[PDB]
Amino acid sequence: LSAEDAKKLTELAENVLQGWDVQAEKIDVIQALVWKVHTDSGAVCLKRIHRPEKKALFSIFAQDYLAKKGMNVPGILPNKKGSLYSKHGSFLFVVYDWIEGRPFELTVKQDLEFIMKGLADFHTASVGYQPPNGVPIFTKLGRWPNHYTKRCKQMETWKLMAEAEKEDPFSQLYLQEIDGFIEDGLRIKDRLLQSTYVPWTEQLKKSPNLCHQDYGTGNTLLGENEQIWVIDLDTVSFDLPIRDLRKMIIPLLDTTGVWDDETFNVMLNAYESRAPLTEEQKQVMFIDMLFPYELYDVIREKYVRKSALPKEELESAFEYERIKANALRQLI
Numbered sequence: 001l002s003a004e005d006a007k008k009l010t011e012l013a014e015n016v017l018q019g020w021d022v023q024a025e026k027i028d029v030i031q032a033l034v035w036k037v038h039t040d041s042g043a044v045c046l047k048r049i050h051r052p053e054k055k056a057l058f059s060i061f062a063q064d065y066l067a068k069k070g071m072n073v074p075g076i077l078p079n080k081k082g083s084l085y086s087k088h089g090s091f092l093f094v095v096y097d098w099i100e101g102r103p104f105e106l107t108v109k110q111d112l113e114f115i116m117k118g119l120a121d122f123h124t125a126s127v128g129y130q131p132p133n134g135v136p137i138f139t140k141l142g143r144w145p146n147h148y149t150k151r152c153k154q155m156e157t158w159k160l161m162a163e164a165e166k167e168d169p170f171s172q173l174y175l176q177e178i179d180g181f182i183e184d185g186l187r188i189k190d191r192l193l194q195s196t197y198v199p200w201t202e203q204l205k206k207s208p209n210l211c212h213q214d215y216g217t218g219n220t221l222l223g224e225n226e227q228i229w230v231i232d233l234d235t236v237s238f239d240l241p242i243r244d245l246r247k248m249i250i251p252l253l254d255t256t257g258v259w260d261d262e263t264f265n266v267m268l269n270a271y272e273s274r275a276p277l278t279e280e281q282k283q284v285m286f287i288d289m290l291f292p293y294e295l296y297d298v299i300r301e302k303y304v305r306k307s308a309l310p311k312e313e314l315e316s317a318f319e320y321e322r323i324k325a326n327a328l329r330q331l332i
């Protein structure tokens with residue numbers, strides 16, 4: 001939203017679109033930089049991918065694979081030279097079909113069920129994808145134990161700068177209670193190493209599914225004939241499918257009050273109706289859900305980003321970890 005800056009971006013789109021055979025009539029800047037390009041009668045999406053060329057290609061080819069396989073992801077329009085993308089400077093440009101649909105309302109039960117079935121569809125459909133020759137794989141298979149340790153060591157490291165701010169309620173409460181959550185973090189790592197996590201990750205290294213890694217109401221839509229579409233595949237990588245469940249369910253249920261088990265059931269039941277999980281697989285998920293990822297995000301706002309948050313937000317983050325621990329104690 002600006003004066004000369006808006007016409008600057010519009011002119012970039014017009015210049016880049018010459019590479020495709022698209023009748024550009026009206027161009028709107030939306031969001032990575034995204035444009036809605038209106039044509040004769042129906043639109044296309046022009047996206048400037050921000051990410052480095054190696055990671056960019058992995059997701060571009062992943063999307064082409066999924067689109068051509070029949071999964072509900074926007075298809076890629078080939079350019080005049082027959083390629084899925086054009087390189088200009090340090091950026092990749094891609095033209096996708098603009099999908100028409102409404103966003104989901106997480107307070108409505110049927111939408112919560114739709115969004116989970118689409119996640120299951122995405123996971124199942126992605127199995128078989130391998131990037132082309134020269135494009136390296138992006139994978140996190142078998143890395144969670146190290147990722148937990150890096151985070152438990154990072155929470156210890158932040159006590160150095162926590163002790164620096166002597167007259168600060170957030171840092172005062174942090175120095176008093178954080179050790180108990182760090183200890184539990186490393187104990188959750190130990191529980192993960194006794195689960196089927198390792199054999200499961202090793203079996204998937206051979207024929208892996210993709211994890212979306214940023215799945216939510218911002219990247220999904222309900223189109224015609226109640227079809228669920230997944231829109232932004234820029235952060236896809238190979239990982240256990242349960243990562244997307246955790247990453248979607250735990251933040252949604254974040255609360256200082258009561259654990260919403262009904263919503264938890266509605267979401268897992270909907271996911272499992274299309275991609276059922278064994279008891280062992282679910283154990284791995286529940287173990288991962290106990291790790292303090294949401295507490296970490298709240299701590300990262302205060303020490304890395306330096307946002308002066310008050311004591312209430314730290315205690316509120318600790319309380320959700322306790323509430324969640326009680327809710328999942330019998331499932332791990």
Ligand SMILES: Nc1ncnc2c1ncn2[C@@H]1O[C@H](CO)[C@@H](O)[C@H]1O
Pocket residue numbers: 030031034045074096097098099100218219220231
């Ligand atoms: N191919 C696409 N189809 C539909 N919506 C899109 C596409 N790319 C980006 N968007 C939308 O842009 C909006 C941001 O204002 C989001 O709601 C997102 O769904």
